[PDB]
Write a protein that binds this ligand. Sequence first.
Ligand SMILES: O=C(O)CNC(=O)C(=O)O
Ligand SMILES: [Mg+2]
Ligand code: NI
Ligand SMILES: [Zn+2]
Length: 331
Amino acid sequence: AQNPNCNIMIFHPTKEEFNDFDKYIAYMESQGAHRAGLAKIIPPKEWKARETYDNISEILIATPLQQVASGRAGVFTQYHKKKKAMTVGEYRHLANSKKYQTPPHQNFEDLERKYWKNRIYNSPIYGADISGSLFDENTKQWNLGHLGTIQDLLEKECGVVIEGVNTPYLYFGMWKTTFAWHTEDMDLYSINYLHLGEPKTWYVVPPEHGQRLERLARELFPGSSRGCGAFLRHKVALISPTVLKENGIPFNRITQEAGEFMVTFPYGYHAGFNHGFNCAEAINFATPRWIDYGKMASQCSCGEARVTFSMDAFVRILQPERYDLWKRGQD
Ligand SMILES: O=C(O)CNC(=O)C(=O)O
Ligand SMILES: [Mg+2]
Ligand code: NI
Ligand SMILES: [Zn+2]
């Protein structure tokens, strides 16, 4: 069995290996990369996502989100308070202001200590989930707006044609912006490219151990757990590495820098934080190996998780027994 300790693997494809996306994902899995839940892919030196980032300031962040925390430093939830619209140039200036800017630090480990000690005492503003792409149309390799669609994969594997579309999303971050513990919708893969700016630190639980994280979360968030049998679908709960180690939960961590891709694998729980002003692009995708995870994915039916149009068909075809209850949650 490849990668039996479920370590995060880092890949350096050549330009020839960067041509065929599906084939390279399958290669990484042949080496055991999925067992970690997360992998890093460093593009060949010949590749670029676009020519420059000098002309992005006029992108609009229609609904910036202020991430307000409640709890204790290592075990907290966050809610998202909507703010007035602002441009990417306005948000960059905000991120660099004395109130929001990254503090002085020694190295990534010192900044990680500072994050976990102090996050809850601040409310950083995140531009999340903005439909769009920063890949040039002429970039032919690993262009996250030109991937094979999940609807086409389901149709290729199972024969059923379904409605829905699959497009990328932009994230504009600042120091302390936070992504809560989650797996993807329908336990899909994700791919995330850090276009510019400061790093993103990730934490991940191996898929084979995901239920250990769920059981800890039910213990740590007992009201939320009574409210919903899949409350981590709400994407609001944070647990620190120190707390995870105290409770024996297997996990790993890694820092993504500008110019690097990360892939999350089906049922790989992940969480993390941004170091300073940055911009990332991410999309969900599927492979043949996903189908069995989609059929078994938990679902939120309490009403909180509310998701895209295109998840309807995935539930309807892969989980027909759960469909009626889940759809009530959506309405
Ligand atoms: O970068 C972020 O805020 C969160 N991204 C992801 O969870 C991802 O790419 O799967
Ligand atoms: Mg612009
Ligand atoms: Ni994710
Ligand atoms: Zn719920």
